[PDB]
Symmetry: D2
């Protein structure tokens, strides 16, 4: 199975819409109430550092309240050293979209050594149709008004975009490793109470959507069971 | 008087450790520090308004690192606008408190989509006339392209502050965060020297209080 | 007199609206045609580096054409080493505004020395009412919807905002010095053909608006004469 | 075959200089280079679509710098998507082509308000398993935390490419710009060594052509 660490946002009535931190399981290690806002653009900000060992996520909407969830986890003990970072989404049987308007990420490995910092950073505010630096899985596509549609714009759609370059998320010799990620999303549905999930995840480099991970398995987990 | 939050590394008797001071010289949290005389050290200080915890690591090449953290809401402690700086004091010893590099980054992300207000600077080489630094006391710039916080040749305090006020919090921001790194060199010919260096954040017109020598680091006027 | 190097945008019928590079004089060293677009947000991008010694500026409008002007100048020979960088605007006798929606700047001094880079960077996407890191001159004010109004929102208004910290723009020991600046502006007028000027400028640290620098002297020059 | 733009520094006879090569090994522009054996050098390469000029500086500590520039519209030369890398070749000499650090930054700013697509990486320490680098030929990572482009102990070519494709141009961008810095160390025991290092940009599946030894640098298949 893949190793997944995910910060996910979902409305699946398994049980209000919530934001949750998932460490290797769909049974969230920590959750907080999130008030989904149909048709508004949301902003999710994920941050981690190895001195604190605290994975944290804030989701806010313009003019509305922020939902925040934090969880103590040492990712050294959870992930491979080299990973791929990406975005996932799964639709229930409703008409709705999962559009990502922008995605940026920064990883930093600071050594013991004076000024020895290794860093990766990418920022996408505009996705082209041939976004060669992204691995698109599922029903995910780019170029859609310069956006990335993660789910098919077909109920029970699942889609994922991973950044191409493997990311060195930790190292047995860094005094501080840290990453931060931010994406803006828009979830539009015609329906009153649509079931939908978006997640930012970190997995082994060769992760693939497990067979049958639709719905609240979010394109990441093969099973709750 | 001035409002100070500081991460300080010192060896003063008054009974080596790294410590977090929130407004008083009586450290809210300290860890044991293994001062390596003549070796270059690096302090990394980090804070964000989601976790509300101030953390630091000091490391030396060969891997003795020390780290300390304190959960504090700096909105409730600091003014909205602050100046940031480096401070140091020597007891009666021949010693240096050299800063080879210092960099800082501050971000306020709004609830508004495409948020960010940011400030960042990086000093890897100090000039003799370093106009973007406010030098207080015995601090000087330029000696080897470095910053000397105390005077190089027995009781000397010095402080360097970045010129621009920094916006460290704003009421509607979804996350405020800052980060600071500085590499320092404390070189004493004496084996067990009394010395202290600190990264601090203060009201924008902080100046060295009367009597802030020794373990008060140029920061505090008393041991309250 | 101050030393001014400015990239300015103006419609003063002295003589189409143009973008011009000004080195110490209001009599632009180089100009290009600019088609002012009332009520639209424009983006100006200024870049310089000391290897090329080419000061360049691009102004674009969403969906419209770009105006670009470039000029060979070695700023080592023009400016003091330490400067203040800022934004200026002057209105003719028309009703119109000069609103800056965002301003970001980056200066970098790279030494001969391995990894010896000094850098300053600031980004404002939101200006508060008490923007303590800006020196406001003239009729300039902040907090206006989180914007900076450079001119009074009074015909023959002049206003300027300078960043607080002196900037080390060059050095006799850097192998490459460079800066880049970007700001978004909105110029609204009710009038058909309003006369207005906006500039990004670099001056000595203690520059002030010269007495009587209204109109096409832009808050920078004391005289054409 | 592969499309190459390269900034190369070499000492091959074939008659020291830094040069800009746009698709051929016959440099479009060269300047005189004063190779300092055993000293660490730093190459800085810069380009933006407004000026449409590719520029480079190589400096050594003690200030011999060399610089070269060429006015070229890289949209008309390069594919839209490229990979970037470092390349080196040794004649028959004992020598190293060590890379101590390499960093790159690419930006595409749209006409759209709040533009930016960006990529940046910074390597100051290479790992033995450096999965974000594609190593070709004799190049290896990890030796001292460094990248060795040719093999360290007579005719060796090696190239390192960053994994992710880079978007270096887009048709609606108001300015595309990139920047590259790398510090290198060429150490030969021999006084006048034949060697060449290059920063290059290629189609994303460039590989070492047959016969690209010596002055062809692992980049070109012939002297055309």
């Amino acid at each position: 199975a893949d190793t997944i660490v995910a910060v996910e946002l979902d409305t699946y009535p398994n049980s209000y819409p919530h934001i949750g931190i998932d460490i290797k399981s769909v049974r969230s290690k920590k959750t907080a109430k999130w008030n989904m806002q149909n048709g508004k653009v949301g902003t999710a900000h994920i941050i981690y550092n190895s001195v604190d060992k605290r994975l944290s996520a804030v989701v806010s909407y313009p003019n509305a309240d922020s939902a925040t969830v934090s969880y103590d986890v040492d990712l050294d003990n959870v992930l491979p050293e080299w990973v791929r970072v990406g975005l996932s989404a799964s639709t229930g049987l409703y008409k709705e979209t999962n559009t990502i308007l922008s995605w940026s990420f920064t990883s930093k490995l600071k050594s013991n050594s004076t000024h020895e910092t290794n860093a990766l950073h990418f920022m996408f505010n505009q996705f082209s149709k041939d976004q060669k630096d992204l691995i698109l899985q599922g029903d995910a596509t780019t170029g859609t008004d310069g956006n990335l549609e993660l789910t098919r714009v077909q109920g029970s759609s699942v889609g994922r975009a991973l950044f191409y370059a493997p990311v060195h998320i930790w190292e047995s010799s860094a005094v501080v490793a840290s990453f931060e990620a931010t994406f803006t999303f828009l979830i539009k549905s015609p329906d009153s109470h649509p079931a939908d999930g978006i997640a930012f995840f970190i997995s082994n480099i060769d992760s693939s959507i497990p067979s049958g991970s639709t719905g609240r398995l979010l394109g990441l987990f093969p099973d709750a069971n």
